[PDB]
Amino acid sequence: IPEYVDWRQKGAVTPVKNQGSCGSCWAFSAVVTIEGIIKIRTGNLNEYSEQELLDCDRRSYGCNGGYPWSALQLVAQYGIHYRNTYPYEGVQRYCRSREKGPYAAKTDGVRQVQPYNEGALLYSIANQPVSVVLEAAGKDFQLYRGGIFVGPCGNKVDHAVAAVGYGPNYILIKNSWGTGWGENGYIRIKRGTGNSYGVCGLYTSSFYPVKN
């Protein structure tokens, strides 16, 4: 794999969104890995409804938390709608997935990269934008302005974001806290420290969709 990966360059990443006051990070995170994998296969960059996953993921907890994997599992068993077809409302309603017609897209499965392994994660990212989790409940992470983030950080992962690339000293991550946070909505956390958990527990639970 190259020394530099940035799925944006390849036009596989949609603008940075703001989840507002919802614990729907897991949703935003999953939706990103979907918009990218679809771009890689189709060649068309589309935005998909995170609201759909927010309302319909029964294994998650709507705006009170959730899991990117179960959300991706829901897109491999049914599919997902366009974002404009199921606009984000920063709140959890009832699943309105049958009031919008067929799914704009669908995947064929979900896989979990080997946890606690920087290489394995890096390998996956090199192939497609990957969903990952980290510890965000920290003044340091919270107030991040730019540059390679090193912490201080804990491995008490409580936030789901999307890894859309990497460099020799970091991993490019797309957050869902609006473009006002970090580097225009993005953050580059440092890699290659020897810590299994990875800075902020970034190597704890990584998933990605499988599309043919």
Side-chain angles (χ1 to χ4, degrees):
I1 54 176
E3 293 175 296
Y4 286 93
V5 175
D6 194 313
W7 282 111
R8 293 179 290 185
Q9 319 281 278
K10 312 308 170 192
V13 183
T14 61
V16 169
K17 282 70 169 178
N18 197 342
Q19 76 193 79
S21 294
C22 263
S24 52
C25 29
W26 50 280
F28 279 78
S29 165
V31 171
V32 169
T33 72
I34 300 175
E35 311 177 323
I37 189 61
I38 289 301
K39 164 61 182 178
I40 297 167
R41 296 287 192 283
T42 305
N44 290 283
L45 187 65
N46 296 151
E47 294 184 313
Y48 296 99
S49 166
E50 314 101 304
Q51 186 62 48
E52 181 152 66
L53 290 173
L54 175 54
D55 300 349
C56 235
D57 195 345
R58 276 201 168 186
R59 280 175 301 185
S60 292
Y61 314 97
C63 279
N64 201 54
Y67 308 99
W69 46 272
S70 78
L72 290 179
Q73 198 93 56
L74 202 166
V75 183
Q77 293 261 293
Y78 299 98
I80 191 173
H81 283 66
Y82 286 123
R83 210 203 181 186
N84 64 53
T85 310
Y86 209 146
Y88 185 55
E89 320 183 12
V91 300
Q92 197 254 188
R93 313 275 288 257
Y94 59 99
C95 188
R96 299 155 283 175
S97 190
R98 300 94 179 192
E99 313 176 6
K100 301 171 178 298
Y103 298 110
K106 177 182 189 300
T107 48
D108 304 293
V110 185
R111 293 195 165 191
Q112 182 193 334
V113 339
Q114 292 84 313
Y116 308 120
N117 188 295
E118 175 179 338
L121 165 58
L122 288 179
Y123 179 44
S124 298
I125 311 171
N127 299 320
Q128 77 210 74
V130 183
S131 165
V132 293
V133 305
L134 55 89
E135 190 189 78
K139 208 169 177 188
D140 308 287
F141 188 80
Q142 303 280 345
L143 310 166
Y144 164 85
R145 274 86 194 192
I148 295 178
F149 190 76
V150 299
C153 245
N155 65 51
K156 178 196 66 198
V157 298
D158 41 48
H159 189 54
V161 283
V164 296
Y166 63 73
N169 310 301
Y170 63 96
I171 293 176
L172 182 60
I173 288 165
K174 181 186 175 193
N175 203 323
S176 53
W177 293 347
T179 58
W181 185 87
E183 307 180 320
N184 269 59
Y186 281 96
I187 177 180
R188 287 179 291 152
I189 306 177
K190 192 208 179 192
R191 75 169 176 88
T193 69
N195 192 306
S196 288
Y197 296 104
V199 172
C200 312
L202 187 67
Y203 305 159
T204 299
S205 175
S206 309
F207 292 75
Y208 60 103
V210 176
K211 181 82 191 77
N212 296 310

mmCIF file of all heavy atoms in Angstrom, residues 28-38 72 128-132 161-163 207-209:
data_model
loop_
_atom_site.group_PDB
_atom_site.id
_atom_site.type_symbol
_atom_site.label_atom_id
_atom_site.label_comp_id
_atom_site.label_asym_id
_atom_site.label_seq_id
_atom_site.Cartn_x
_atom_site.Cartn_y
_atom_site.Cartn_z
ATOM 1 N N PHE A 28 -23.581 8.237 11.059
ATOM 2 C CA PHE A 28 -22.781 9.048 10.168
ATOM 3 C C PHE A 28 -21.559 8.285 9.708
ATOM 4 O O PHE A 28 -21.212 8.311 8.528
ATOM 5 C CB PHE A 28 -22.369 10.332 10.863
ATOM 6 C CG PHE A 28 -23.433 11.366 10.847
ATOM 7 C CD1 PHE A 28 -24.503 11.295 11.725
ATOM 8 C CD2 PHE A 28 -23.409 12.378 9.890
ATOM 9 C CE1 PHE A 28 -25.540 12.215 11.648
ATOM 10 C CE2 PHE A 28 -24.443 13.303 9.803
ATOM 11 C CZ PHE A 28 -25.511 13.222 10.682
ATOM 12 N N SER A 29 -20.919 7.603 10.654
ATOM 13 C CA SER A 29 -19.725 6.805 10.384
ATOM 14 C C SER A 29 -19.979 5.708 9.354
ATOM 15 O O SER A 29 -19.193 5.523 8.424
ATOM 16 C CB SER A 29 -19.214 6.166 11.677
ATOM 17 O OG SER A 29 -18.285 5.130 11.415
ATOM 18 N N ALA A 30 -21.080 4.982 9.523
ATOM 19 C CA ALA A 30 -21.422 3.904 8.610
ATOM 20 C C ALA A 30 -21.760 4.458 7.239
ATOM 21 O O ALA A 30 -21.304 3.956 6.208
ATOM 22 C CB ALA A 30 -22.603 3.113 9.156
ATOM 23 N N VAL A 31 -22.565 5.505 7.229
ATOM 24 C CA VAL A 31 -22.979 6.093 5.973
ATOM 25 C C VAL A 31 -21.801 6.553 5.140
ATOM 26 O O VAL A 31 -21.891 6.603 3.919
ATOM 27 C CB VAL A 31 -23.947 7.264 6.217
ATOM 28 C CG1 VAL A 31 -24.210 8.015 4.923
ATOM 29 C CG2 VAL A 31 -25.247 6.729 6.771
ATOM 30 N N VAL A 32 -20.694 6.880 5.790
ATOM 31 C CA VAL A 32 -19.524 7.332 5.054
ATOM 32 C C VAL A 32 -18.849 6.167 4.328
ATOM 33 O O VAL A 32 -18.484 6.276 3.160
ATOM 34 C CB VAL A 32 -18.528 8.027 5.997
ATOM 35 C CG1 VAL A 32 -17.201 8.266 5.285
ATOM 36 C CG2 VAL A 32 -19.119 9.346 6.457
ATOM 37 N N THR A 33 -18.701 5.045 5.019
ATOM 38 C CA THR A 33 -18.082 3.885 4.407
ATOM 39 C C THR A 33 -18.948 3.408 3.228
ATOM 40 O O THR A 33 -18.451 2.797 2.281
ATOM 41 C CB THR A 33 -17.888 2.750 5.452
ATOM 42 O OG1 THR A 33 -19.152 2.158 5.783
ATOM 43 C CG2 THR A 33 -17.266 3.320 6.720
ATOM 44 N N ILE A 34 -20.239 3.709 3.274
ATOM 45 C CA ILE A 34 -21.136 3.306 2.204
ATOM 46 C C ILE A 34 -21.002 4.203 0.982
ATOM 47 O O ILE A 34 -20.887 3.719 -0.149
ATOM 48 C CB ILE A 34 -22.594 3.318 2.682
ATOM 49 C CG1 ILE A 34 -22.737 2.336 3.846
ATOM 50 C CG2 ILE A 34 -23.530 2.965 1.526
ATOM 51 C CD1 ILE A 34 -24.092 2.327 4.506
ATOM 52 N N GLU A 35 -21.009 5.513 1.211
ATOM 53 C CA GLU A 35 -20.882 6.485 0.125
ATOM 54 C C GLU A 35 -19.565 6.298 -0.619
ATOM 55 O O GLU A 35 -19.474 6.588 -1.810
ATOM 56 C CB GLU A 35 -20.951 7.908 0.683
ATOM 57 C CG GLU A 35 -22.124 8.133 1.620
ATOM 58 C CD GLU A 35 -22.136 9.524 2.232
ATOM 59 O OE1 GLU A 35 -21.042 10.048 2.551
ATOM 60 O OE2 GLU A 35 -23.244 10.076 2.404
ATOM 61 N N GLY A 36 -18.555 5.805 0.086
ATOM 62 C CA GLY A 36 -17.271 5.600 -0.541
ATOM 63 C C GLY A 36 -17.206 4.310 -1.329
ATOM 64 O O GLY A 36 -16.807 4.296 -2.497
ATOM 65 N N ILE A 37 -17.607 3.213 -0.703
ATOM 66 C CA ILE A 37 -17.558 1.940 -1.391
ATOM 67 C C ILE A 37 -18.393 2.010 -2.668
ATOM 68 O O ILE A 37 -18.045 1.405 -3.680
ATOM 69 C CB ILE A 37 -18.065 0.802 -0.493
ATOM 70 C CG1 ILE A 37 -17.783 -0.548 -1.163
ATOM 71 C CG2 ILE A 37 -19.535 0.993 -0.195
ATOM 72 C CD1 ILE A 37 -16.294 -0.820 -1.395
ATOM 73 N N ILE A 38 -19.488 2.758 -2.628
ATOM 74 C CA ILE A 38 -20.324 2.883 -3.809
ATOM 75 C C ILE A 38 -19.585 3.650 -4.894
ATOM 76 O O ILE A 38 -19.735 3.358 -6.077
ATOM 77 C CB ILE A 38 -21.649 3.603 -3.496
ATOM 78 C CG1 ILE A 38 -22.538 2.693 -2.651
ATOM 79 C CG2 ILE A 38 -22.356 3.987 -4.787
ATOM 80 C CD1 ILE A 38 -22.879 1.370 -3.323
ATOM 81 N N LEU A 72 -24.323 -1.197 9.262
ATOM 82 C CA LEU A 72 -23.845 -1.674 7.984
ATOM 83 C C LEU A 72 -24.497 -3.005 7.658
ATOM 84 O O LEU A 72 -24.712 -3.328 6.493
ATOM 85 C CB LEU A 72 -22.322 -1.797 7.993
ATOM 86 C CG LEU A 72 -21.531 -0.489 8.035
ATOM 87 C CD1 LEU A 72 -20.064 -0.829 8.070
ATOM 88 C CD2 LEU A 72 -21.842 0.399 6.823
ATOM 89 N N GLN A 128 -10.500 1.099 0.924
ATOM 90 C CA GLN A 128 -11.760 1.840 0.989
ATOM 91 C C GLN A 128 -11.893 2.586 2.306
ATOM 92 O O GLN A 128 -11.254 2.228 3.301
ATOM 93 C CB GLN A 128 -12.931 0.871 0.895
ATOM 94 C CG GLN A 128 -13.166 0.142 2.210
ATOM 95 C CD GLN A 128 -13.736 -1.227 2.031
ATOM 96 O OE1 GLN A 128 -13.037 -2.143 1.615
ATOM 97 N NE2 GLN A 128 -15.015 -1.382 2.335
ATOM 98 N N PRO A 129 -12.746 3.621 2.339
ATOM 99 C CA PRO A 129 -12.928 4.373 3.575
ATOM 100 C C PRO A 129 -13.455 3.385 4.600
ATOM 101 O O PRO A 129 -14.381 2.629 4.314
ATOM 102 C CB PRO A 129 -13.971 5.420 3.196
ATOM 103 C CG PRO A 129 -13.716 5.638 1.750
ATOM 104 C CD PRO A 129 -13.501 4.235 1.235
ATOM 105 N N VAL A 130 -12.860 3.381 5.786
ATOM 106 C CA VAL A 130 -13.273 2.464 6.828
ATOM 107 C C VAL A 130 -13.883 3.165 8.046
ATOM 108 O O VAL A 130 -13.524 4.291 8.396
ATOM 109 C CB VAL A 130 -12.076 1.592 7.279
ATOM 110 C CG1 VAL A 130 -12.518 0.568 8.321
ATOM 111 C CG2 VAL A 130 -11.477 0.885 6.073
ATOM 112 N N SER A 131 -14.839 2.488 8.671
ATOM 113 C CA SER A 131 -15.491 3.000 9.856
ATOM 114 C C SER A 131 -14.628 2.609 11.041
ATOM 115 O O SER A 131 -14.124 1.482 11.110
ATOM 116 C CB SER A 131 -16.871 2.384 10.011
ATOM 117 O OG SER A 131 -17.359 2.602 11.324
ATOM 118 N N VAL A 132 -14.461 3.546 11.967
ATOM 119 C CA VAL A 132 -13.658 3.327 13.160
ATOM 120 C C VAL A 132 -14.212 4.098 14.351
ATOM 121 O O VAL A 132 -14.985 5.050 14.197
ATOM 122 C CB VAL A 132 -12.187 3.770 12.953
ATOM 123 C CG1 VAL A 132 -11.503 2.873 11.920
ATOM 124 C CG2 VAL A 132 -12.139 5.242 12.503
ATOM 125 N N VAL A 161 -16.336 7.362 13.889
ATOM 126 C CA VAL A 161 -16.032 8.232 12.770
ATOM 127 C C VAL A 161 -15.617 7.404 11.571
ATOM 128 O O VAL A 161 -15.712 6.171 11.580
ATOM 129 C CB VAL A 161 -14.916 9.242 13.119
ATOM 130 C CG1 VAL A 161 -15.495 10.353 13.988
ATOM 131 C CG2 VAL A 161 -13.765 8.542 13.842
ATOM 132 N N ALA A 162 -15.164 8.091 10.531
ATOM 133 C CA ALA A 162 -14.735 7.427 9.312
ATOM 134 C C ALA A 162 -13.290 7.765 8.942
ATOM 135 O O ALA A 162 -12.899 8.934 8.903
ATOM 136 C CB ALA A 162 -15.683 7.793 8.162
ATOM 137 N N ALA A 163 -12.518 6.709 8.682
ATOM 138 C CA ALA A 163 -11.109 6.773 8.285
ATOM 139 C C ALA A 163 -11.097 6.808 6.765
ATOM 140 O O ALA A 163 -11.411 5.814 6.121
ATOM 141 C CB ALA A 163 -10.381 5.535 8.765
ATOM 142 N N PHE A 207 -14.907 -1.365 11.111
ATOM 143 C CA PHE A 207 -15.724 -2.099 10.157
ATOM 144 C C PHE A 207 -15.814 -1.401 8.819
ATOM 145 O O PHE A 207 -15.607 -0.191 8.702
ATOM 146 C CB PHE A 207 -17.146 -2.305 10.688
ATOM 147 C CG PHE A 207 -17.230 -3.235 11.869
ATOM 148 C CD1 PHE A 207 -16.835 -2.815 13.138
ATOM 149 C CD2 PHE A 207 -17.741 -4.525 11.715
ATOM 150 C CE1 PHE A 207 -16.957 -3.665 14.237
ATOM 151 C CE2 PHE A 207 -17.865 -5.382 12.802
ATOM 152 C CZ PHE A 207 -17.477 -4.955 14.071
ATOM 153 N N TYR A 208 -16.125 -2.187 7.802
ATOM 154 C CA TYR A 208 -16.279 -1.648 6.476
ATOM 155 C C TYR A 208 -17.251 -2.493 5.675
ATOM 156 O O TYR A 208 -17.374 -3.701 5.883
ATOM 157 C CB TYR A 208 -14.931 -1.581 5.781
ATOM 158 C CG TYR A 208 -14.230 -2.907 5.625
ATOM 159 C CD1 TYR A 208 -14.229 -3.559 4.398
ATOM 160 C CD2 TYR A 208 -13.500 -3.470 6.670
ATOM 161 C CE1 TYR A 208 -13.513 -4.729 4.204
ATOM 162 C CE2 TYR A 208 -12.775 -4.648 6.483
ATOM 163 C CZ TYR A 208 -12.788 -5.266 5.241
ATOM 164 O OH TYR A 208 -12.056 -6.403 5.005
ATOM 165 N N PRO A 209 -17.976 -1.858 4.753
ATOM 166 C CA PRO A 209 -18.941 -2.593 3.932
ATOM 167 C C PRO A 209 -18.274 -3.373 2.782
ATOM 168 O O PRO A 209 -17.182 -3.023 2.335
ATOM 169 C CB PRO A 209 -19.865 -1.485 3.434
ATOM 170 C CG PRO A 209 -18.915 -0.339 3.243
ATOM 171 C CD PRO A 209 -18.005 -0.414 4.459
#
